[PDB]
């Protein structure tokens, strides 16, 4: 969806995606 508190954009040097096989919030 889209809220007025979140802007729509995408920095060209970063790829927005998540691998389904890895759980995020880890390093």
């Amino acid at each position: 969806n889209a809220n007025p508190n979140v802007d729509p954009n995408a920095n060209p040097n970063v790829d927005p995606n998540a691998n389904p096989n890895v759980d995020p919030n880890a390093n």
Partner: antibody
Amino acid sequence: QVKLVESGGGVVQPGRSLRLSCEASGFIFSTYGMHWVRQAPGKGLEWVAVIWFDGSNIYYADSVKGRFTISRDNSKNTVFMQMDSLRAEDTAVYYCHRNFYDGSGPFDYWGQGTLVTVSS
Amino acid sequence: IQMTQSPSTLSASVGDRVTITCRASQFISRWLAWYQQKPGKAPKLLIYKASSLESGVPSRFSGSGSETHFTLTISSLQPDDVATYYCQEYTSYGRTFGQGTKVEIKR
């Protein structure tokens, strides 16, 4: 860095008006807007008002009414609020809130807090 | 929109599993956040999107849930994590806070 400071606290004769103003320093306005939030003594938090940059929605909480007019100064990046027709239960602590979510993370920047009390 | 928190008062020993419920009323997507306030200070943001994490937050905290039912879980307690937790909602312009939840210790 970014800091928020407010002023105007003090004792007030019940039935008399009072003015609140939040000072914004360390950044430039005209991005998303600000909020006012308060906390009753010993209770949970509660929402009060909202003001975006320039003329926008001025949505208020149902517990209060048009007696809580809020406006932004045209020259500087300050927000004003008018208090009037107070009650015995309106004593609380008023904070200053400005939150907006971007594509890289969150930003919170909470205020400091001032005290307003009513008595005789 | 009325928003309620079920577990008004919780307690546990040094290291347990504690669960909190933030069941809303209306229909919202994954738009929710949690705040932790220590006495005599200002709140702090903990998680957003009901599943993500903040920066510089211990990995023990981990939210979950979707649609309407939302839960928060802690793997181990430690004495440092005694505070009050509020569950928020930031759909559209207005924001309405929760009701409150206090966690304590027992020796």
